[PDB]
């Protein structure tokens, strides 16, 4: 066991998925700030197979999974892995494809019905419409598996209408719309309190 790094320490039943926009709408330095936000959030969670489980995926035209929910590693090592996520700078970061991945790979089987399941979709870009044909189907699929989708729009190129589409599919799908990556550290305490509140204590 590893002791808490902060007074805020979420010890609840939660599967938390971090989906990181891999597009070039974020510079390499801005992506660094996004990764620091993910690490900051992880430091405030009790990461363990019996408490908070985390997954970290960078999405472009396709997914690169760095951490899976079932990965039995020390929190310190998971935070190190997240801090070493490589910059992609891709042209396309498809929200449809990464939500498909979340629905059909991460939550293909619900191992923990007693836990809340939350997807933090950190978006900085807009995928081409030719990739969005099944976007609503995937968001609806996640709703049916009781997966809460929380879009975090970052910067002026975030897909605002997909964010609004996500909010409409289920009332749990609250959105956070930010000016830039610099705002992540300022809203972090609010976001993690909100996510913790969504999870049960027992």
């Amino acid at each position, epitope marked *: 066991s590893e*002791p*808490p790094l902060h007074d*805020f*320490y979420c010890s*609840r039943l939660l599967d938390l998925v971090f989906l990181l926009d891999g597009s070039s709408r974020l510079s390499e330095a801005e992506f660094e700030v996004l990764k620091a936000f993910v690490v900051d959030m992880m430091e405030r969670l009790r990461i363990s197979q019996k408490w908070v489980r985390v997954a970290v995926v960078e999405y472009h035209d396709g997914s690169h999974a760095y951490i899976g929910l079932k990965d039995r590693k020390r929190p310190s090592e998971l935070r190190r892995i997240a801090s070493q996520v490589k910059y992609a700078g891709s042209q396309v970061a498809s929200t449809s494809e990464v939500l498909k991945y979340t629905l059909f790979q991460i939550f293909s089987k619900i191992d923990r019905p007693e836990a809340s399941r939350i997807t933090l979709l950190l978006m900085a870009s807009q995928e081409p419409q030719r990739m969005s044909r099944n976007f609503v189907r995937y968001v609806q699929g996640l709703k049916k598996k009781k997966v809460i989708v929380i879009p975090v729009g970052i910067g002026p190129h975030a897909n605002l209408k997909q964010i609004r589409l996500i909010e409409k599919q289920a009332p749990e799908n609250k959105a956070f719309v930010l000016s830039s990556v610099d705002e992540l550290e300022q809203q972090r305490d609010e976001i993690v309190s909100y996510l913790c509140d969504l999870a049960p204590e027992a």
Partner: nanobody
Amino acid sequence: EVQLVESGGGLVQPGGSLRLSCAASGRTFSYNPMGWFRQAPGKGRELVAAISRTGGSTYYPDSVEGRFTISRDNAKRMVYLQMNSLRAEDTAVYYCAAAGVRAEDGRVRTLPSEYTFWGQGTQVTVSS
């Protein structure tokens, strides 16, 4: 559950020292904000020391401030109360307690109603 077990009480002369220990266990223990209460014979329970989840903040009432020190060891899941310059009026049963109301907030807790989990108490007697 959360389980708490205290030790370290004793019989001391005025001016003496003790160091109470409280061992926490149970799967739902989350390095909760912890506190020490004391109960003089036939009276109520009073919070005499409190500490945050990390240990970076503490609280004592002015009646024991300067003389009591609360600390914790999260690797060992322990909390401690060092009691210096003991006075006759410190005679009481001392209880270790853990806050279980919105425990994700690890700040120091001063309200007794925030304390959910309790040890069995250890006796401190100060007599000349």
